[PDB]
Amino acid sequence: VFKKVLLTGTSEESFTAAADDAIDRAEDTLDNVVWAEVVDQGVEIGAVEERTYQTEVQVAFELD
């Protein structure tokens, strides 16, 4: 059985790096992370100093 968590990673560099930011976080606290699906991408301009790329991913991990 796989379970997914819906995480939004951020990066001042790229959409790929923002995806990696989310996946890194998942791998910090979950075992057996197996894949991630991009579900949205955006750029924060107003709330930050430099543009921040955001990539939202469903991160899948195997239960048990």
Ligand X SMILES: Cc1cc2nc3c(=O)[nH]c(=O)nc-3n(C[C@H](O)[C@H](O)[C@H](O)COP(=O)(O)OP(=O)(O)OC[C@H]3O[C@@H](n4cnc5c(N)ncnc54)[C@H](O)[C@@H]3O)c2cc1C
For binding to Mg ion (CB under 5 A), which residues are involved? 12, 40
- DSSP, res 47: S
Give, as ranges, the residues between 3 and 22 that touch Na ion (CB under 5 A). 6
The distance of closest approach from Cβ of residue 62 to Cl ion in the complex, given in angstroms and rounded to an integer, is: 18
Residue set of the binding site: 13, 35, 37, 40, 44, 50, 54, 56
Q: Does 30 bind a second copy (CB under 8 A)?
A: no
Element (H, E) at 26: helix 15-29
44 binds, among ligand X, Mg ion, Na ion, none (CB under 5 to 8 A by kind): ligand X
Fill in the amino acid letter for 33. Answer: V
Backbone angles phi, psi at 12, to 5 degrees: -85, 0
Note whether 19 and 33 are within 8 A (CB).
no
